[PDB]
Write a protein that binds this DNA or RNA. Structure first.
Lengths: 307, 105, 92, 97, 79, 97, 80, 109, 95
DNA sequence: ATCGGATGTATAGATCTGACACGTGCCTGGAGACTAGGGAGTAATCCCCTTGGCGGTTAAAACGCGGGGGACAGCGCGTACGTGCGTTTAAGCGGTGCTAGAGCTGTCTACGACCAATTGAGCGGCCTCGGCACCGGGATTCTCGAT
DNA sequence: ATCGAGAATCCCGGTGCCGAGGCCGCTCAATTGGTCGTAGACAGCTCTAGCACCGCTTAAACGCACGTACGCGCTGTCCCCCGCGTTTTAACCGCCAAGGGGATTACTCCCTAGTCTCCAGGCACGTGTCAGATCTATACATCCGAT
């Protein structure tokens, strides 16, 4: 079964990390990644760097674990990179708090909300399933998508973990029809259609991976081409999988936050409600308010608004 | 010489042709149109008058009165349809009684 | 100098019943009937001419107006009588 | 003495008035009613005699037609007597109101 | 100056008899007066309006015939 | 089990077909009927699809109006079922008979 | 073409009655309303075909049907 | 020749006046048509259009629909008494019928 | 080209936006509005033509259209229509 | 009124898309500006016909009973029509292929508008007499108790 | 369950009487010739949408098995609308007056048809910009059989 810090002590390794720098309960189930489950209280399990892990935290430490031994230093580095631990959240909160008193009020109660370094492919298809949907549902869809087309890893209790599907697999024959039986709705083709476009028209995996060196403007532009990947989804990918920290998603949640917490309204736009250019304007508004890491500040308020 | 006699009619072709133009029903009017209209008017008048004369003779009267016209109109299922939504003044109604009203035997 | 069709209705009555008369009280109904039928036919002929973007009222227009207004059995005889009259008028 | 059973005299006068062609309505009360109604639309209105006569003929023709329709409704409802339900059913189905 | 009561009870009975009716209820004797008033108002409205357009002060029979024809109840015998 | 009472699945779908705005009759059977009727007046006639649609819509409106009048006539006779006698009564009152 | 009035099935009549506010249906209603529909369609199609023939055409357009319904007393909006 | 100004705007109108005047000329209604008659008629037409469009917009707002469909037009006509009287003999294409059920048909409690 | 076919679409759209500046209208509704305005135009014009013939007149002035409006439009609808139409005619006469 | 199943609506970290809105090219129908003549407004006037009045007359409307027959409520029966479930079926949709005639243009003709002269017909106007309404007497049809 | 008394309604005969209809003058509109202008009859060409077929999906029609609610026949009650006698009252009906307004005549003057330039409002068409719908799970709200 799933390990716990108390049951198999000699299988856990720690990483210096204060709760002020990271709160797993505020990051893993908040819509960034849909692959983590609190199988046991305060213990989150999921796939990280092609293998299963269980993570749990004390006050100043982040504890990590057919493994038959404690995580190695090399493996632990995989975890630090996933949580981008070289970035000091305390410095970011300070800055955002200094230029936005509302953020300061919220930030007092929701510390440790950071951003996850992610894999481009997993991020692209998970958010293609994020559209017009709720986190609870999205989570199920992504799980069934991985069980059906992803590599089988290991089994803990009655849970069999799977790696994320490859482009070749998602581009396979009759994938759409399968995913509709798996309840993906119309997003089923979006998945099939985007895998093929990438493989047969954009120059495969290399095309998506190269975007990480490209500019936010370029990257976002490149992604909007893919079926199911309009402005909100593209920004999600840029921010969470392509290292574009200034990329601000503009969903219903950030729509409400802007309105009630900043009394914001479109000025350059035409419409008074959500539209492609009002959404674009809201994004710039947040960028001019918080700066270069505006997307990360967005992640904090979004997580807090879920609560 | 008269266009009524020349067409073998009794209704005035000239008068119908005047009324057709004065009434400005269209910019122009044909020559056979008043003749055709006069013929139709004559035939309808003959039909009404023939049934009215029969109805008047049925009641031993050699003079036609509006009651005879109403009886003749209502006794023909085609002419009644043609004049379904119109009233003959002092024409009365068609005598009928529903069978339920009639006394028990 | 009002104008009425009393003379023509009387002539038709003499043709259909040589020995029966008509009261002027009903002859007024005859006038108001022939005038009403004339108005009802010419109105449909005017609409026909305007419908087909035409500007002339012809025998075809009157015949179609008759075919539209009068019911089956009466309209067949009306059309036949009008056709005979216009045929005779053209032949003479 | 001699008393007619009810209904037989009520079936009589039906024949009499169907064969009849008079107006069945007193002329002066109707003329005064027409003038009274015309006051609501204009003061000091004159009427030709034939105008009042034509209004009378049209009004009674309409009333007789309405009564025929209500009679059809009355027999239809397994009844013999007219009720205001019949007046209103006939007016509504005919489209008047 | 109420004059609708001039349409008496026996005249209403006579009209119903011509309609072909055996028995009449009491409430008819006012319901049909109301109906007749409504119809007369509707017709005389158009008649008086025609008289206004023609700028006369007498209501001719021809105006009544026009008004009745406008409502679909054409009348023969006056014009 | 689970069985509904006969009064419910009537008012249900009465609300539905008063809210909704379909044509309620399959298009092709009505088209063939129109063709067959038009055969008697002229042979080898060709109907514009809009003409068939207009005929269908007008027939639907006429039949719904007739059914409203039929329902009123049925309710007048202390009945909730429409009988044919209701249909010819409504047609007779309206003036189609 | 023959025997096409049966194409208007009993469920179609039921749906029409339900739209018309009718709660419950007898048995002879279907035959009676098929007869009524035949009569009404004959009345409108005769005038439509007459309108078409007067224009020397072999195609019955929606415009002629609209004019015929206007004469019949329905004055259908929408089409043209 | 001065600056061209339409007769519809001279009268402060929206419906056209020249078009209505031409239609009156070409409809063979009378030999001559007065100058003010097309203006009046256009005013009446625009008022009626504004009335029906007001009712249709209210019905559409009640149904939370931004655009106006024939169903809203038919419902607006049938709800208002005066317009229903004006358009009693007129069928709206795919307009539907006014929702109503007779009180007798409703179930007993 | 498909010939000059003269429709009231633009005028109806202008009125609709002057009444509710944020509501669109479908093509079926414009077709219905076009048929409606053509129907009312034909009705009023025919009635006014009948008035012109009755009074043995020869022209259709404003007051025949006024009378036709009072015959056709029911009650307060006719009242409002006459009032606004006379407003428009006075505005036009004041150039 | 209460309660557990059936339905119905709002919503959920967006996206697509057939329909609509809008911009623009381009003409053709609306405007501006003149004249011409006649339709309509206006002043004067005359008759007639609608309004108002009075007095006799009596037909018809109001009123009051007696009663009986028809509306109405209740009630039992029975059956037929609503409802649900499984089984055909042909409606509907997408696609392809073909051509009948709908819809335009082009030309020229013959058919109707229009005007001048002519003449007869069908409209007021007037006078007669016979078809028809009315009164009364008598023959005989339906109704309603007697038996 | 079929006859007389009694109204009641035709049949017939006499008796006025006032419209129906036959002449008569006439004058204004129908008829006839002739000229000129353009609506459309006839030819001809394009293309489009109506028809015809065909394969596949699947919502919808059909048929059969229930079972309970509604149509209908039957009884009993009571009430209110008939038929009829009696009283009144207001409508008919014959006069009278009388003057308001509808029709008619003769100016006369502005108002709209007709025509010729001249131009921008609206139509046709080509791109942006979207409101409705979207698969399905879920959180409620709402209705309905059973209690």
């Amino acid at each position: 079964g799933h390990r716990t810090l108390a049951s198999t002590p000699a299988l856990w390794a720690s990483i210096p990390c204060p709760r002020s720098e990271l709160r797993l309960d505020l990051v893993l189930p908040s819509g960034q990644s849909f692959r983590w489950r609190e199988q046991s209280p305060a213990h989150w399990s999921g796939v990280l760097a092609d293998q299963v892990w269980t993570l749990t935290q004390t006050e100043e430490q982040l504890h990590c674990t057919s493994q038959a031994s404690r995580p190695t230093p090399d493996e632990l580095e995989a975890v630090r990179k996933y949580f981008q631990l070289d970035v000091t959240l305390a410095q970011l909160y300070h800055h955002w708090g200094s230029v936005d008193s509302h953020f300061q009020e919220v930030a007092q109660k929701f510390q440790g909300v950071r951003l996850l370094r992610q894999d481009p492919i997993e991020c692209l298809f998970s958010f293609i399933c994020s559209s017009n949907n709720n986190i609870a549902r999205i989570t199920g869809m992504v799980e069934r998508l991985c069980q059906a087309f992803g590599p089988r890893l290991i089994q803990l209790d009655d849970v069999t973990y799977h790696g994320f599907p490859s482009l070749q697999a998602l581009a396979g024959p009759e994938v759409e029809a399968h995913l509709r039986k798996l309840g993906l709705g119309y997003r089923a083709r979006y998945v099939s259609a985007s895998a093929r476009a990438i493989l047969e028209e954009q120059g495969g995996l290399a095309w998506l991976q190269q975007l990480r060196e490209s500019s936010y403007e370029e990257a976002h532009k490149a992604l909007c081409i893919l079926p199911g990947v309009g402005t909100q989804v593209a920004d999600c990918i840029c921010l969470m999988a392509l290292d574009k920290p200034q990329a601000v998603p503009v969903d219903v949640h950030m729509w409400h936050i802007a309105q009630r917490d900043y009394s914001w309204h479109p000025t350059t736009s035409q419409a008074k409600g959500p539209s492609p250019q009002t959404n674009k304007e809201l994004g710039n508004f947040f960028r001019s308010l918080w700066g270069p890491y505006a997307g990360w500040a967005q992640a904090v308020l979004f997580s807090a608004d879920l609560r | 010489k008269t266009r009524s006699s020349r067409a073998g009619l009794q209704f005035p072709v000239g008068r119908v042709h005047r009324l057709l133009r004065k009434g400005n029903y269209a910019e122009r009017v044909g020559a056979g149109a008043p003749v055709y209209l006069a013929a139709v008017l004559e035939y309808l008048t003959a039909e009404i008058l023939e049934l009215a004369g029969n109805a008047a003779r049925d009641n031993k009267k050699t003079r036609i009165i509006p009651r005879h016209l109403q009886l003749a109109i209502r006794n023909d299922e085609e002419l009644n349809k043609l004049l379904g939504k119109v009233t003959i003044a002092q024409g009365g109604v068609l005598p009928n009684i529903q069978a339920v009203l009639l006394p028990k035997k | 100098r009002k104008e009425s069709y009393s003379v023509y209705v009387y002539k038709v009555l003499k043709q259909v019943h040589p020995d029966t008369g008509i009261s002027s009280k009903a002859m007024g109904i005859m006038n108001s009937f022939v005038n009403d039928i004339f108005e009802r036919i010419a109105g449909e002929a005017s609409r026909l001419a305007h419908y087909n973007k035409r500007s002339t009222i012809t025998s075809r227009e009157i015949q179609t107006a008759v075919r539209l207004l009068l019911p089956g059995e009466l309209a067949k005889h009306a059309v036949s009588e009008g056709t005979k009259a216009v045929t005779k008028y053209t032949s003479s | 003495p001699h008393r007619y059973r009810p209904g037989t005299v009520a079936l009589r006068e039906i024949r009499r008035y169907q064969k009849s062609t008079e107006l069945l309505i007193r002329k002066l009360p109707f003329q005064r009613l027409v003038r009274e109604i015309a006051q609501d639309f204009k003061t000091d209105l004159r009427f030709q005699s034939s105008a009042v006569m034509a209004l009378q003929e049209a009004s009674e023709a309409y009333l007789v037609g309405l009564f025929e329709d209500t009679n059809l409704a009355a027999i239809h409802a397994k009844r013999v007597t007219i009720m205001p339900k019949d007046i209103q059913l006939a007016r509504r189905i005919r489209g008047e109101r | 100056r109420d004059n609708i009561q001039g349409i008496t009870k026996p005249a209403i009975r006579r009209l119903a008899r011509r309609g072909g009716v055996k028995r009449i209820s009491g409430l008819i004797y006012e319901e049909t007066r109301g109906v007749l008033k409504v119809f007369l108002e509707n017709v005389i409205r158009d008649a008086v309006t025609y008289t206004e357009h023609a700028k006369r002060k007498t209501v001719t029979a021809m105006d009544v015939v026009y008004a009745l024809k406008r409502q679909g109840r054409t009348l023969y015998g006056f014009g």
